[PDB]
A paper describes a structure:
In prokaryotes, the DNA replication initiator protein is DnaA. SirA, a protein produced under Spo0A∼P regulation, has been identified as an inhibitor of DNA replication that plays a specific role in preventing replication re-initiation in cells committed to sporulation. Furthermore, the SirA binding determinants of DnaA have been mapped to its N-terminal domain, DnaADI. Here, we have solved the structure of SirA from B. subtilis in complex with DnaADI providing the first structure of a DnaA domain in an inhibitory complex.
A vestigial N-terminal Gly-Pro-Ala sequence inherited from the DnaADI polyhistidine-tag can be seen in molecule D, and an additional N-terminal Ala is visible in molecule B. SirA–DnaADI is seen as a heterodimer, with molecules A (SirA) and B (DnaADI) forming one heterodimer and molecules C and D forming the other. SirA consists of a single globular domain comprising seven β-strands and five α-helices in the order β1-α1-α2-α3-α4-β2-β3-β4-β5-α5-β6-β7. DnaADI from B. subtilis consists of four alpha helices and three beta strands in the order α1-α2-β1-β2-α3-α4-β3 with a β-sheet topology of β1-β2-β3. The binding of SirA and DnaADI is mediated by helices α1, α2 and α3 of SirA and α2 and α3 of DnaADI. Seventeen residues on each chain contribute to the interface which constitutes 12% and 8% of the surface areas of DnaADI and SirA, respectively. In the complex, 1240 Å2 of otherwise accessible surface area is buried in the interface. On the corresponding DnaADI binding surface of SirA, Phe14, Tyr18, Gln48 and Ile52 contribute to the core and Glu13, His17, Val24, Leu28, Gln41, Met44, Lys47 and Tyr51 are prominent in the rim.
Residue numbers in the entry:
A (entry chain A): 2 to 141
B (entry chain B): 0 to 81
The structure:
Amino acid sequence: ERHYYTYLIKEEFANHYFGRESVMFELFQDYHWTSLEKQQYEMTEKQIQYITQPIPILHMHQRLKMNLNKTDYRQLDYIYRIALPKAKGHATFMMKEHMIEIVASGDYEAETIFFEVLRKVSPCFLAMDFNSKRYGWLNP
Amino acid sequence: AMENILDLWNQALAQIEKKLSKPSFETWMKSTKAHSLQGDTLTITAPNEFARDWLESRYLHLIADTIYELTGEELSIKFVIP
């Protein structure tokens, strides 16, 4: 099972941390996981808010519904859930505020369906799995 | 003096607050603290490495300008973490 936290990074910070994306991964991992003193956590949260963009919810909804048409999917407001053809896998997409969360199982096609919509919306999505230490840009 | 560097940094933050947007001031500047002034070097404590890096990269000129406007002197600005 894969679990990605995906943020839309501002251009200025993407550029600044080009070739140093591990530092952004560590910032995000500190917010989601690391046991930080309350004040360190609050600074980290403020920083994350600053360097990221709000998810364009209505734009995402439109693009998702077009791409998933006649796929095994359902929508529950900001949650999309899909099952791949021929029983090959499953994935959940959740969008809220500045964060997208994806959970996937089976073939890597499962998350790829969502990543393909995202990468056509912007080159600036950074997807990170804090369980497996897999992270990177969704490259168009 | 110990109280004197606090005064200088508080004055510089108050001027910086009149220059920057609220999100930039609150995110990057507001939690900084004076650490030391020795020779030509003013050392400022940033709350974490991420902040240290961005302050060094983006705000050193602004801080140096602010200190120059307040004192008439050029101070080298350095950032450390706790």
